[PDB]
Design a protein around this nucleic acid. Structure first.
Ligand SMILES: [K+]
Ligand SMILES: [K+]
Ligand SMILES: [K+]
Ligand SMILES: [K+]
Ligand SMILES: [K+]
Ligand SMILES: [K+]
Ligand SMILES: [Mg+2]
Ligand SMILES: [Mg+2]
Ligand SMILES: [Mg+2]
Ligand SMILES: [Mg+2]
Ligand SMILES: [Mg+2]
Ligand SMILES: [Mg+2]
Ligand SMILES: [Mg+2]
Ligand SMILES: [Mg+2]
Ligand SMILES: [Mg+2]
Ligand SMILES: [Mg+2]
Ligand SMILES: [Mg+2]
Ligand SMILES: [Mg+2]
Ligand SMILES: [Mg+2]
Ligand SMILES: [Mg+2]
Ligand SMILES: [Mg+2]
Ligand SMILES: [Mg+2]
Ligand SMILES: [Mg+2]
Ligand SMILES: [Mg+2]
Ligand SMILES: [Mg+2]
Ligand SMILES: [Mg+2]
Ligand SMILES: [Mg+2]
Ligand SMILES: [Zn+2]
Ligand SMILES: [Zn+2]
Lengths: 95, 132, 91, 215, 98, 25, 200
RNA sequence: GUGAAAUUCUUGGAUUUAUGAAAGACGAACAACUGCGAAAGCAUUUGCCAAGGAUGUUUUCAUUAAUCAAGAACGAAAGUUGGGGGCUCGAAGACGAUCAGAUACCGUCCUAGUCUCAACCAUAAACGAUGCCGACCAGGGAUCGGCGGAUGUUGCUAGGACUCCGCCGGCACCUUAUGAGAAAUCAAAGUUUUUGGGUUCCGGGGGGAGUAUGGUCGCAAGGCUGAAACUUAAAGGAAUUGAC
RNA sequence: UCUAGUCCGACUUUGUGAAAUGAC
């Protein structure tokens, strides 16, 4: 899994958690990698992928629902998707 | 339609239990019974149905009937009770096989076909066994 | 404080119907009135509307489930059984 | 009396084996609502491979032959599996050594579905001093894995006729022993049993390929 | 008084051993405690080998052997004389006899 | 008397006392 | 009056410009917004409706048709289902096990929904009250409460009358008894507590 | 089917033979003075999930430890409630024998049960009849796991298999007394009147009695806790000679 | 002493074939 690599970003890199901010980062090209939970709404999932394809940004499908993704990020709220602005330590390379 | 010298092989199913003996002759497929004589058909007491003497008489009748049908060679498939019960052939197995050999029948390939479970269902008698 | 030692939710029946029936109905009384995890939105906001019908308060998804529980034991077995058969046919 | 109305028929084996005169079998003569050919169809005959191959070294192996067609007085059979004799298997299973068994379901090019069973035993070295030749469970799993892989390859490519030709010399057994020697030396590597789970519907054209003109 | 160091069975470093059923009476007995004998003999008794061989339908044929593994309980082994009561000194001898 | 059966006898005797005492509460 | 929930499904009409509304017995696991596929080539997933010919052996199905096109008569109650046993390509028929445990032959063209009927386990919960039974049958039919025949007078029931409440004759009555005489255990092959293979 | 029989089945085709299918259970041989697990217990294949001992280590923390009232987890079989399943076997019940009698042993049929799920029960000769941690004190071979060294063979792909030496850890066994013990016997049950490493549980003649009572746990079956009055000169352990 | 219903057989609705067996 990518939990170990993701944990490093939460304390050393830059990120935005949530659907509204993820679109903002894709619009400004600040997002380098988009992670989406497996229970994300199908329409929302397609929209994010279309945005990422338009901005030439890689998309990775998280192995879990929004609950697991938030916990892996060291937070107490569900996250359907997130964007990585700064990889921090070898997060975008091996993905 | 058999010429002289040619052997017409049959299959003799010998079931040698400790209470009775069966001498069942069939074809190679086992789906066509030729003759079937049991030790109980040659004795009057229930105790002698499995005796070697009863098995010998049954074998003699089987051998005579086989010749009438043109059968002169027999494949032997001996078996005990099997299953979860005793695997030891009864006392009439040796007598029946020897009697067939001494009646003009040419013994073919002998095999043991006792049903052997690869595990099995629980045996009767309880965990303390048959107490005598 | 602890209002009842063991009766719990079946305390609404007072002294009626016998202890065994109250004990027997307690399992289903607790389950049918509890919140269940919503696989779609990820919230514990699924409650029974009617027998066999379970709707999520947040996302509005309505699901057909068990009479008193969202997922019956046989429901899980059927899904795995159907999944196994589909893989063989789709091989 | 009942035997006076039975007609004897000869059993013919496929062209794979040497001797085709398997034996003779009888059946009640054709009569209304009971056709003689129907009674003889799909009859299973168990005969030692020594008789078919006329070699006493193969007495330990039995061949299952089932009737396919009845052309005149000859019953045309076909390979329907094989198995060891009870004495043979009981002789190979000995104490102080490891027993390894494997099974695999494979489909031949003729749409025949088979279930081959393999068996092998650990072998002592000439200079070995310890009384046992046990193999570790991890080694057993490695050996079993190679048994399955080799069995699939030999059966998934060849047809039923060619596959049976490999059982007589036990070519598959030698290949398994050669491949697994790097893991643990083995002895008595055989294909213990072969089952015919699903067979393609009858086709007289293919049946006569392995049968000659017995007229 | 403790009669045997092994307690009449063969169990070390394990709690439970599944039982087997006595070949004679069917009594349940732990496998490590049952008396086991592996009997190998010709399927045809020596008194009938000559007759069967003369009637053989093949030029060469080896009579198959009968392999039977017998598992007895203590009571049946003693009664059947598979094992006998030995003196206190001779009980320790574990090597099979001649 | 075998200890197991003596134990069985006492257990039966305790049921009668239990039932004979709850008869009057 | 029906324990099993129902599902409203909208279909596109094959040749008319309009929507086609349908009402299906809901299968366990169905949810709103789910896509349901009906036809010969529909995939084997819970909720889809397939002909028995396309359903492999051992599958769990519900609302199975008895006649091709009758739209489902079998295994419709909550928590009930049918099991596909085997197929017979020669006869074009299929063997299924019904909820009662009986095996039946149906043509392979009969359709069936994959899965079991939702709402199972309903009957496990005790009613505990006459009023709960009253509400249950208030929406079914006029069959509750039931008065025992032995509590009636002879004029209105064969079991009525007598200075003690008792049947007075065998409660097992033959199959051919005329209406008004056929009360009690009708054509009973046996009576009493079902012990042993009887209760299988 | 039995010592012998009978209950029982059978020309309406029993038993027997071949083929095929279903059902449920079980996992033979391999299988051992072998392995794993806290114990109970664990044995068909492959995949997945988390966990673990030992070994190796010139890695890291630096006393964080040992044993434990209270309080907790697990705990064969049987049993209890309900659903499923219900082959085999089979308490109770019935019957056939045997017998002076036979509610038994033997035989035949069979209910609960035996399998599974959910929830309880917490007891076994649950035994190594031997609590756990630590040090020391004979010899010997075999075996299981890991590692180090040496060596030349393999119808084999440095390695594996085998051979030889050694180290650590484990299940055990064999000889022996310089030891211990009432002895049987024990390499610990040794290092104890030359008495003291640490710590928990627990016994005080035999019965009454694991009974009465109270409390507590359990749906129940019962579990845990647990007396007294009174009675008795023995009961008991190991070993010896006889008789049987 | 009867009867609705119900079960059962024959004829009727009721035609086209085949095979086995049997009678004249
Ligand atoms: K023993
Ligand atoms: K009413
Ligand atoms: K009533
Ligand atoms: K009355
Ligand atoms: K517990
Ligand atoms: K060692
Ligand atoms: Mg005795
Ligand atoms: Mg919301
Ligand atoms: Mg090794
Ligand atoms: Mg003694
Ligand atoms: Mg251990
Ligand atoms: Mg134990
Ligand atoms: Mg009522
Ligand atoms: Mg009145
Ligand atoms: Mg009246
Ligand atoms: Mg096995
Ligand atoms: Mg092992
Ligand atoms: Mg305590
Ligand atoms: Mg338990
Ligand atoms: Mg205790
Ligand atoms: Mg103890
Ligand atoms: Mg302790
Ligand atoms: Mg202990
Ligand atoms: Mg070693
Ligand atoms: Mg010693
Ligand atoms: Mg002291
Ligand atoms: Mg005392
Ligand atoms: Zn939701
Ligand atoms: Zn015994």
């Amino acid at each position: 899994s990518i939990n170990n690599r993701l944990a490093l970003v939460m304390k050393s890199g830059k990120y935005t958690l949530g659907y509204k901010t993820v679109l903002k980062t894709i619009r400004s090209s600040k997002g380098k990698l988009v992670i989406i939970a497996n229970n994300c709404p199908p329409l929302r999932k397609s929209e994010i992928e279309y945005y990422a394809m338009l901005a030439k940004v890689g998309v990775h499908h998280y192995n879990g629902n929004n609950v697991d993704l938030g916990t892996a990020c060291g937070k107490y709220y569900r996250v359907s998707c997130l964007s990585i602005i700064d990889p921090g330590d070898s997060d975008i390379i091996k993905s | 339609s058999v010429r002289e010298g040619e052997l017409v092989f049959g299959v003799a199913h010998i079931f040698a239990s400790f209470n009775d003996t069966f001498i069942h002759v069939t074809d190679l497929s086992g789906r066509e019974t030729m003759v079937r004589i049991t030790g109980g058909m040659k004795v009057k007491a229930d105790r002698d149905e499995s005796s070697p003497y009863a098995a010998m008489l049954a074998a003699q009748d089987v051998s005579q009937r086989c010749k009438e049908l043109g059968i002169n060679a027999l494949h032997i498939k001996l078996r005990a009770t099997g299953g979860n019960k005793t695997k030891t052939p009864g006392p009439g197995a040796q007598s029946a096989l020897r009697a067939l050999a001494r009646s003009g029948m040419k013994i073919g390939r002998i095999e043991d076909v006792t049903p052997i479970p690869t595990x099995s269902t629980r045996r009767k008698g309880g965990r303390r066994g048959r107490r005598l | 404080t602890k209002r009842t030692k063991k009766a719990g939710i079946v305390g609404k029946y007072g002294t009626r119907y016998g202890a065994s029936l109250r004990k027997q109905i307690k399992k289903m009384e607790v389950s049918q009135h509890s919140k269940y995890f919503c696989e779609f939105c990820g919230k514990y906001a699924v409650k029974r509307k009617a027998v066999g019908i379970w709707g999520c308060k947040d996302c509005g998804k309505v699901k057909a489930g068990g009479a008193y529980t969202l997922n019956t034991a046989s429901a899980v077995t059927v899904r795995s059984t159907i999944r196994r058969l589909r893989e063989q046919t789709e091989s | 009396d009942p035997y006076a109305k039975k007609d004897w028929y000869d059993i013919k084996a496929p062209s794979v084996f040497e001797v085709r005169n398997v034996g003779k079998t009888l059946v009640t003569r054709t009569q209304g609502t009971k056709i003689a050919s129907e009674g003889l169809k799909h009859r299973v005959f168990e005969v030692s491979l020594a008789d078919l191959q006329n070699d006493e070294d193969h007495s330990f192996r039995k061949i299952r032959l089932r009737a396919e067609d009845v052309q005149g007085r000859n019953v045309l059979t076909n390979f329907h599996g094989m198995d060891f004799t009870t004495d043979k298997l009981r002789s190979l299973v000995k104490k102080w050594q490891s027993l390894i068994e494997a099974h695999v379901d494979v489909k031949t090019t003729d749409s025949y579905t088979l279930r081959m069973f393999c068996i092998a035993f650990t072998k002592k070295r000439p200079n070995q001093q310890k009384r046992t030749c046990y193999a570790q469970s991890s080694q057993i799993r490695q050996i079993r894995r190679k048994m399955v892989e080799i069995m699939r390859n030999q059966a998934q490519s060849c047809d039923l006729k060619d596959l049976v030709l490999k059982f007589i010399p036990e070519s598959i057994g030698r290949e398994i022993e050669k491949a697994t020697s790097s893991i643990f030396p083995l002895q008595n590597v055989f294909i213990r049993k072969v089952k015919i789970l699903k067979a393609p519907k009858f086709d007289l054209g293919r049946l006569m390929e392995v049968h000659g003109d017995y007229s | 008084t403790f009669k045997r160091r092994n307690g009449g069975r063969n169990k070390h470093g394990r709690g439970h051993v599944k039982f087997i059923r006595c070949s004679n009476c069917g009594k349940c007995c732990p496998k490590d405690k049952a008396i086991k004998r592996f009997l190998v003999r010709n399927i045809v008794e020596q008194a009938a080998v000559r007759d069967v061989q003369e009637a053989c339908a093949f030029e060469l044929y080896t009579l198959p052997k009968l392999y039977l593994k017998m598992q007895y309980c203590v009571s049946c082994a003693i009664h059947s004389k598979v094992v006998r009561v030995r003196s206190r000194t001779d009980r320790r001898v574990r090597e099979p006899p001649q | 008397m075998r200890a197991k059966w003596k134990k069985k006898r006492m257990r039966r005797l305790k049921r009668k006392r239990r039932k004979m005492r709850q008869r009057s509460k | 009056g029906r324990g099993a929930p129902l599902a409203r499904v909208t279909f596109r009409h094959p040749f008319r410009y309009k929507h086609q509304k349908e009402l299906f017995v809901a299968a366990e696991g169905m949810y709103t917004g789910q896509f349901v596929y009906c036809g010969k080539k529909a995939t084997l997933m819970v909720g889809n409706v397939l002909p028995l010919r396309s359903i492999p052996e051992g599958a769990v199905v519900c609302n199975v048709e008895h006649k091709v096109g009758d739209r489902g008569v079998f295994a419709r109650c909550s928590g009930d289902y049918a099991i596909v046993i085997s197929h017979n390509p020669d006869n074009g028929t299929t063997r299924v096990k019904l909820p009662s445990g009986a095996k039946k032959i149906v043509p392979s063209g009969c359709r069936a929904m994959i899965g079991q009927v939702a709402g199972g386990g309903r009957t496990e919960k005790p009613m505990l009250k006459a009023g709960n039974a009253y509400h249950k049958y208030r929406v079914k039919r006029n069959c509750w409460p039931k008065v025992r025949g032995v509590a009636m007078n002879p004029v209105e029931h064969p079991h009525g009358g007598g200075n003690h409440q008792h049947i007075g004759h065998a409660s097992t009555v033959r199959r051919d008894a005329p209406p008004g005489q056929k009360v009690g255990l009708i054509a009973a092959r046996r009576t009493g507590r079902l012990r042993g293979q009887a209760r299988a």
